[PDB]
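From the thread on structure requests for the teaching lab: each student submitted one protein with a one-line request. Submission from student K.M.:

"Model Lysozyme C from Gallus gallus, tokens only."
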Amino acid sequence: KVFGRCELAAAMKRHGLDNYRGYSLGNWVCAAKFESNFNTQATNRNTDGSTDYGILQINSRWWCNDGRTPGSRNLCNIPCSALLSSDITASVNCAKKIVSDGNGMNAWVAWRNRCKGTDVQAWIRGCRL
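Reply posted by the TA:
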């Protein structure tokens, strides 16, 4: 599923991401935009053999099991394929664990490079919350 901007903001808000660990909703929407282009089915393979999955491009090296990343952790206790569903619940719940890790949203390279220090609230402008 390819979410609309405001549709995703509403789904994220409903799942508790607005101001989660002090990160306003605009931050999560911005990160999803540049990580996956709002596409739940997005996959990208990394140089180390790990793969990023779904709307927030969650990585198989630490966070999910895809059965093909030797010596990896499964810290969110889910198959990576569960991150590709049109229902964003598993992605949101895993993201909450990631952002509580100590490094905040800096764990998302695209957030750090393209969202951090920008007017992130512009990503939720015009939306019926």
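TA comment: The helical segments are 5-14, 25-36, 89-99, 109-114. The beta strands are 43-45, 51-53, 58-59.
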